[PDB]
Amino acid sequence: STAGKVIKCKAAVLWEEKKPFSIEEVEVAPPKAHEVRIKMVATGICRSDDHVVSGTLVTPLPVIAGHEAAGIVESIGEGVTTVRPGDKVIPLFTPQCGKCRVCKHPEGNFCLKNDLSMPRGTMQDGTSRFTCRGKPIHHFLGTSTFSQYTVVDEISVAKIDAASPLEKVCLIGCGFSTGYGSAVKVAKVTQGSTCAVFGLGGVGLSVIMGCKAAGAARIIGVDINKDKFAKAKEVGATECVNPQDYKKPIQEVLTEMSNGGVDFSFEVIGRLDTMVTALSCCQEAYGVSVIVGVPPDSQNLSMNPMLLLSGRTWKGAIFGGFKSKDSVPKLVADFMAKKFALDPLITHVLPFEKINEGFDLLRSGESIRTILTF
Amino acid sequence: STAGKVIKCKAAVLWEEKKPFSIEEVEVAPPKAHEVRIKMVATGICRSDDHVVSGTLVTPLPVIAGHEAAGIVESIGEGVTTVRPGDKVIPLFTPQCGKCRVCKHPEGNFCLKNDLSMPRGTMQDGTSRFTCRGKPIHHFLGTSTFSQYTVVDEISVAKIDAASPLEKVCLIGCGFSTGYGSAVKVAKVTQGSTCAVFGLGGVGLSVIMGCKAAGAARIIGVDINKDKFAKAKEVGATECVNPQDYKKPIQEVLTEMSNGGVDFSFEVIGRLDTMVTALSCCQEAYGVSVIVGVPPDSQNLSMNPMLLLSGRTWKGAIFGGFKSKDSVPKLVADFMAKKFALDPLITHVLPFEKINEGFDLLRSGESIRTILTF
Numbered sequence: 001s002t003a004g005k006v007i008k009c010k011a012a013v014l015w016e017e018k019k020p021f022s023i024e025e026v027e028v029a030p031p032k033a034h035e036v037r038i039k040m041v042a043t044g045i046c047r048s049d050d051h052v053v054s055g056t057l058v059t060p061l062p063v064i065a066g067h068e069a070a071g072i073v074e075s076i077g078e079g080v081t082t083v084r085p086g087d088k089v090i091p092l093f094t095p096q097c098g099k100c101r102v103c104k105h106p107e108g109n110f111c112l113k114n115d116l117s118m119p120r121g122t123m124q125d126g127t128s129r130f131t132c133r134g135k136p137i138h139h140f141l142g143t144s145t146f147s148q149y150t151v152v153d154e155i156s157v158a159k160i161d162a163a164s165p166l167e168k169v170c171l172i173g174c175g176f177s178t179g180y181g182s183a184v185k186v187a188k189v190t191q192g193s194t195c196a197v198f199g200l201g202g203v204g205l206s207v208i209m210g211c212k213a214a215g216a217a218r219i220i221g222v223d224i225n226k227d228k229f230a231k232a233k234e235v236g237a238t239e240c241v242n243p244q245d246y247k248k249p250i251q252e253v254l255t256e257m258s259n260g261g262v263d264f265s266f267e268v269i270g271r272l273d274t275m276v277t278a279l280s281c282c283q284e285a286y287g288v289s290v291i292v293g294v295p296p297d298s299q300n301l302s303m304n305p306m307l308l309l310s311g312r313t314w315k316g317a318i319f320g321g322f323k324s325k326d327s328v329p330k331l332v333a334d335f336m337a338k339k340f341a342l343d344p345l346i347t348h349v350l351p352f353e354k355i356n357e358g359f360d361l362l363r364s365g366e367s368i369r370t371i372l373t374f
Numbered sequence: 375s376t377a378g379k380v381i382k383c384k385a386a387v388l389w390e391e392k393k394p395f396s397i398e399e400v401e402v403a404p405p406k407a408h409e410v411r412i413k414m415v416a417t418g419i420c421r422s423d424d425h426v427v428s429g430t431l432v433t434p435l436p437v438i439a440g441h442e443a444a445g446i447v448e449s450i451g452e453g454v455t456t457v458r459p460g461d462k463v464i465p466l467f468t469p470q471c472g473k474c475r476v477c478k479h480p481e482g483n484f485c486l487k488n489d490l491s492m493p494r495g496t497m498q499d500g501t502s503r504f505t506c507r508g509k510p511i512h513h514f515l516g517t518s519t520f521s522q523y524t525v526v527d528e529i530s531v532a533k534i535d536a537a538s539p540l541e542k543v544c545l546i547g548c549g550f551s552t553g554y555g556s557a558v559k560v561a562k563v564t565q566g567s568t569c570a571v572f573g574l575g576g577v578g579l580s581v582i583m584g585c586k587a588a589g590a591a592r593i594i595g596v597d598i599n600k601d602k603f604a605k606a607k608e609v610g611a612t613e614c615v616n617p618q619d620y621k622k623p624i625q626e627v628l629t630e631m632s633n634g635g636v637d638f639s640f641e642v643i644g645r646l647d648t649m650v651t652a653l654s655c656c657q658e659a660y661g662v663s664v665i666v667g668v669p670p671d672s673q674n675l676s677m678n679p680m681l682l683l684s685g686r687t688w689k690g691a692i693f694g695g696f697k698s699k700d701s702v703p704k705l706v707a708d709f710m711a712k713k714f715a716l717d718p719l720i721t722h723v724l725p726f727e728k729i730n731e732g733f734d735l736l737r738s739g740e741s742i743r744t745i746l747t748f
C-alpha cells in the first residue's frame with residue numbers, strides 16, 4: 001500500500017538542455033493538503049516537451065517534463081473534494097482555480113495560477129515533490145507526466161469518465177483540445193469559410209478537425225514536410241501547399257488561392273516568420289489569425305501595423321481557450337459519444353522506457369503523436 | 375448655372391511636404407459618369423491631414439487634402455442615383471462600393487476601392503479632376519475636401535438629412551465616427567469594463583464617448599499633454615494619466631491601476647511604441663487592444679508574440695469599422711436626435727482661408743477640432 005508514503009518509481013529526468021532524457025528511479029512524496037498523487041497510464045509527446053529539451057521554452061532544470069497525459073488517482077491530500085482514489089484523471093497544464101479574475105471571466109482560460117508565464121517549476125506551495133539521486137527535481141507546468149507517479153495541485157486535475165480509454169484520451173490533455181478549441185472557440189470558424197493552417201503536426205491536425213467541424217468550405221494545410229499532407233487531407237484539408245515549392249512568399253500564394261485572403265489562419269508551428277505570414281494571408285479587412293505555436297524564448301517579431309489597421313484581428317491562446325477543469329471532462333464525454341476522433345493523431349504507441357525513441361520520431365518528422373504507455 | 379462647366383474656385387494645394395498650404399485658384403472639371411461635384415460648406419482638420427504634410431501618411435503630391443467634411447451637391451454625372459443636386463452630403467474617405475467581398479461581408483468595412491492602402495491620389499478611373507497653374511493635382515482618399523468644390527465617385531458620398539447642421543456633422547466624416555465606432559463596434563466595449571485610451575485628441579475623445587455610451591465603469595485617458603485632461607473628463611474619462619509623471623513604463627502603471635490589466639485599450643496617437651504599450655496594458659488572458667492611430671509610413675513595430683499567446687486580442691480598424699455609406703446617414707440622424715454630442719470636439723472655428731492657422735493650432739497642442747467654413 002502507498003498512501004501517506006514516499007513512492008520510489010521510474011521517471012524520465014531532463015538534467016540539462018539538449019541531452020537525452022534519463023530513465024531512472026525518483027522519489028515521489030505523498031500529497032499535501034489540496035494535492036493529488038496520480039499513477040500515470042499514458043502520456044503523449046507534444047512538441048512543447050521538446051521545446052524544454054531544445055531551450056525554446058525556458059523552465060527550471062533539472063525537470064520531469066510531460067504535460068499531455070492520463071492516469072488513475074493513487075491518493076489525495078487533506079481537503080480534496082473533486083477526485084478520489086481510483087478515479088481516472090487528466091492533469092491540467094493550465095489550471096482552473098475558479099477564484100481569479102480570469103477564471104471568473106466568461107472568455108478567459110489562462111488562470112493566474114499557471115506556471116507558464118513565469119515558470120517556477122514547483123507545486124503551488126513553491127516546493128517540489130520529486131527527488132532523484134538526493135537532488136530536488138522541478139515540476140513542469142504543474143503536471144510532470146513523464147513519471148510513473150506525479151503529484152499535482154487539485155486545481156490542475158480533472159476527473160473523467162471511469163470507462164475512458166486513457167491511451168487515447170490523454171491527447172485531450174494538450175494537443176487535441178488546443179487545436180480543436182483554437183478553431184471552434186478562439187477563432188470561431190464559420191460555416192462556408194476558408195481556413196489556412198500552418199503546421200500539420202498533432203496540434204495542426206486538431207485545428208483542421210475543428211475547422212471541418214465548424215463547417216469550413218476550404219481548409220488549406222501548409223507544411224514544409226509534404227509527408228504530412230496525406231493525413232491532413234484525411235482529417236479535412238481540401239488542399240495542401242509546401243512553401244518550398246513556390247518562388248513567391250506563401251502569404252502571396254494563399255492570398256491568390258483565396259481570391260484576396262483567407263477568413264481564418266492559424267500558426268501551429270512556433271516560428272516568428274510564420275506568425276507574420278499567417279497574419280498577412282488572412283483578408284485585410286475582416287480576417288482573423290490565431291497564434292497557437294509557442295515562440296522561441298525572448299524573441300520579438302517585426303510587423304507592419306497597417307496589417308491590423310485595415311481590420312484584421314490577431315489573437316493567440318493557450319489550450320484552445322478552454323477553461324480546463326470545466327472542459328476536459330466534457331471533451332472526454334464527447335469523445336466517448338463519438339463526436340470527434342483521436343486515432344488519426346496517433347502514429348506510434350511505445351512503452352514509456354522508449355521515451356527517447358519517441359522524441360527521435362518527432363524530431364525526424366516521422367510521427368504525429370507517440371503515446372507512451374506505463 | 376455651372377452644370378457641365380469647369381468651375382474655377384479656391385483650394386488649399388499642398389505642393390511640397392512640410393510647407394504651408396497654398397490657397398489659390400484651381401480648375402474643377404465637371405463630374406463624369408457616376409461622379410458627384412460638391413460645393414463644400416465645412417471641413418475639419420484631422421491629424422491625418424497633417425500626416426500628409428509631415429510625410430507620415432504617404433500619398434502622391436501635389437495634392438488637395440481634406441477628408442472630414444460636409445457640403446451640398448452642385449451637379450451629378452450620368453447614372454448617379456443616390457444623390458441629387460441640392461442634397462446635403464458627407465464625402466466618404468472609405469468608400470462603400472456595395473459589390474466587393476468586403477462590402478458583402480457582415481463585419482467588413484474597408485472596401486477594396488479605397489485609396490488608403492496603396493494611395494494613387496486619383497478618382498476611381500485613375501484620373502484627376504483638378505488643375506492648378508495648368509498642372510494636374512492629386513486627390514486624397516477620393517475626397518479632397520480642402521477646396522470650395524470637389525468631385526467624388528458616387529461610392530464615396532452619402533446623402534444626409536436636409537436639416538443637418540453641416541458645420542457640426544462634418545465630424546461624422548472622420549473623427550467622431552472613427553473613435554465612437556472603434557469603441558462600440560470594433561472593440562465592443564462592455565458594461566462595467568475598464569478602458570484605457572491613448573491619445574486625447576478629437577479621435578480619442580470620441581473613443582471615450584463610445585466607451586461611456588457602452589457603459590464602461592472606468593475610462594483611463596492617457597496623454598503626454600495634461601492640457602487635454604479636462605475635456606477628456608468632461609466627455610467621460612474617470613481619470614487621466616501622463617506617462618511623463620511616472621518612473622515606471624505606463625503599461626505597468628495601467629496594469630497596477632486596473633488590478634491586472636484593462637478590459638479594452640485603444641491606441642489613438644500613431645506611434646509604434648504606444649501600439650505595443652496599449653496591447654501590453656490589456657489583461658493578458660482576455661484583454662482587447664484596438665489600433666486607431668495611423669503609423670509612420672513603411673515602419674515596422676517589434677513585439678513579443680507571448681503577449682498574444684496568453685489570450686489577448688489585437689485588432690485595428692479604419693473609420694470605426696462602419697460601413698460608410700450605410701452608416702453616415704444614420705449617425706447624422708442620431709446626432710439630430712441628440713444621441714451623442716459633437717460640440718465637445720470643436721474648440722476653434724475659422725474661415726477656410728485661415729487653414730494654415732488651423733494647422734498651427736493643431737500642431738501647438740491647443741486645438742481638438744478646428745472647423746473651417748467656406
Ligand SMILES: NC(=O)c1ccc[n+]([C@@H]2O[C@H](COP(=O)([O-])OP(=O)([O-])OC[C@H]3O[C@@H](n4cnc5c(N)[nH+]cnc54)[C@H](O)[C@@H]3O)[C@@H](O)[C@H]2O)c1
Nearest residue numbers: 047048178199201202203223224225269270293294318319
Ligand atoms: N498554445 C498552446 O496551448 C499549445 C499547445 C500545444 C502545442 N503548442 C505548440 O504548437 C506547436 C505545434 O505543436 P505540435 O503539433 O505538437 O508540433 P509538431 O508535431 O512538431 O508539428 C509542427 C509542424 O510544423 C511544420 N513546420 C516546421 N517549420 C515549418 C515552416 N517553416 N513552415 C510550415 N510548416 C513548418 C513541421 O513540419 C511539423 O509538421 C509547437 O510550437 C507547440 O509548442 C501550443
Ligand SMILES: NC(=O)c1ccc[n+]([C@@H]2O[C@H](COP(=O)([O-])OP(=O)([O-])OC[C@H]3O[C@@H](n4cnc5c(N)[nH+]cnc54)[C@H](O)[C@@H]3O)[C@@H](O)[C@H]2O)c1
Nearest residue numbers: 421422552573575576577597598599643644667668692693
Ligand atoms: N483609423 C482611422 O480611421 C483614423 C481616423 C482618424 C484619425 N486617425 C489617426 O488617429 C490619430 C489621432 O488623430 P487625432 O485625434 O486627430 O490626433 P491629435 O489631435 O493629434 O491627437 C493625438 C493625441 O496624442 C497625444 N500624444 C502624442 N504623443 C503621445 C504619447 N507618446 N503618449 C500619449 N499621448 C501622446 C497628443 O498629445 C494628442 O493629444 C492620428 O494618428 C490619426 O492619423 C485614424
Ligand SMILES: [Zn+2]
Nearest residue numbers: 097100103111
Ligand atoms: Zn484561476
Ligand SMILES: [Zn+2]
Nearest residue numbers: 046048174175
Ligand atoms: Zn502541449
Ligand SMILES: [Zn+2]
Nearest residue numbers: 471474477485
Ligand atoms: Zn466595396
Ligand SMILES: [Zn+2]
Nearest residue numbers: 420422548549
Ligand atoms: Zn481623419
